Amino acid sequence: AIDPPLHMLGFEFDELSPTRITGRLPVSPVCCQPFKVLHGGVSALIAESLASMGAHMASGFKRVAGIQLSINHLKSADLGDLVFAEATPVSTGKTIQVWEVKLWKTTQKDKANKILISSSRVTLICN
Amino acid sequence: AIDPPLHMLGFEFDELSPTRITGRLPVSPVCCQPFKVLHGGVSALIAESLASMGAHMASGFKRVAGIQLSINHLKSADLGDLVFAEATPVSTGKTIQVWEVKLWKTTQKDKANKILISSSRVTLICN
Amino acid sequence: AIDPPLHMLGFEFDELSPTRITGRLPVSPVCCQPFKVLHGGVSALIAESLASMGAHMASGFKRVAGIQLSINHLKSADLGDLVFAEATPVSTGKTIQVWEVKLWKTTQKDKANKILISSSRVTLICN
Amino acid sequence: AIDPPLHMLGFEFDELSPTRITGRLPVSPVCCQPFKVLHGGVSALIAESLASMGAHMASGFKRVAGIQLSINHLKSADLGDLVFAEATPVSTGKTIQVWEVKLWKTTQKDKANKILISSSRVTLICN
Secondary structure, three states, X not given: OOOHHHHHHOOEXXXXXXXXXXXXXXXXXHHEEOOOEEOHHHHHHHHHHHHHHHHHHHOOOOOEEEEEEEEEEOOOOEOOXXXXXXXXXXXXXXXXXXXXXXXXXXXXXXXXXXXXXXXXXXXXXXX | OOOHHHHHOOOEEEEEEOOEEEEEEEOOHHHEEOOOEEOHHHHHHHHXXXXXXXXXXXXXXXXXXXXXXXXXXXXXXXXXXXXXXXXXXXXXXXXXXXXXXEEEEEOOXXXXXXXXXXXXXXXXXXX | XXXXXXXXXXXXXXXXXXXXXXXXXXXXXXXEXXXXXXXXXXXXXXXHHHHHHHHHHHOOOOOEEEEXXXXXXXXXXXOOOEEEEEEEEEXXXXXXXXXXXXXXXXXXXXXXXXXXXXXXXXXXXXX | XXXXXXXXXXXXXXXXXXXXXXXXXEOOHHHEEOOOEEOHHXXXXXXXXXXXXXXXXXXXXXXXXXXXXXEEEOOOOEOOOEEEEEEEEEEEOOOEEEEEEEEEEEOOOOOOOOEEEEEEEEEEEEO
């Protein structure tokens, strides 16, 4: 509950390191836009949170701010699916960092096969 | 509670029409990344939600899906500020709609003067 | 010919100032992707050039670099159309500037009616 | 001369297949913004062109149109460097394709080591 929005959505962190942040989100009702699919805004919120955590870590816990996000929503995910997120750096300098955040789903019917649903690039200035 | 995650964050919708959607968000602790500023992911979530509501309306209630979001974070907003959001169409065709979403803040000290903090373009596919 | 790509494409500048840069591009064969429509890459090249010129001017002719561009291609333009470009600042601080670049077309048949075909946001760091 | 503005800038295509398009660009004076670095607009123009060629191929030669481009400029390239470009699909469906385009440079001094300078995501609508 230090990212309260992520906590509220039921996101759970797996790995944190300066080169990689992962976690998971069961797609629950609070996560959905009204057709019982995952809200694209929730994918965007995830991308921003994990990229900012990554950047903080990669910068020596100096202050960072997201200044641009670009996200592609590739496929929908349904209520009851499970989403996996992974953030990694595309570029780290002293001033600008760029992170990529990928989201994949698995379903009730098929739980093995991670299907890419979202891909994002987050640009951050590191103070 | 026509967008459940936004409702839980304290967002209130104001105007809905086929050319303009608005509402407001008090910047409360649940909306903040941990330095007591508004979470950039929340700004993204707002852009996606309002653009989607707009498109759904402007399309005559066909199914719409956000496929790309680009957001610029221009300025931060602090805990205790009030955020105002406005979505309007940049382009509406039969298949693709592009909506712009602007976020402004006012503060405790200065409540007259809306200061732009974020601007977003959301690309949606319709029917 | 200080932006040689723009010169090569036949772009012509109209107004330069720290708050507004305009010009025009006849849509000629060199400007087209192979269906005799304006190349989306050419719109993107315009957006980058004008935004960078604007930022240079607005920054006191200090060094600037484009670090992110996001562009929406809203409508096509045909061989023989005329394109108009306008760059203006969305946000100017000391470190980050954000410019918007809009492109409109007029056609042989209809020359009065400027139809918006492209809209872009360019994020620049100003050194 | 399957993309005329790129051809005039000195771009050479290398590989075409439904999952990968490549080519190269010597960074010559015609490709430069005026401080003797590669024009960011040229990097954008490359992304759009190659993603579009890819989509046209991966769709079985249906008509495709770029509707959104997001590009991160990570590092500059100097006059005299050589740029390598590679486009590959992130998502291919029937209606929307998303392609990623990476640009790398090598230099006169160091010709072995490809250094990533740009990364782009291009969203296209097909048929």
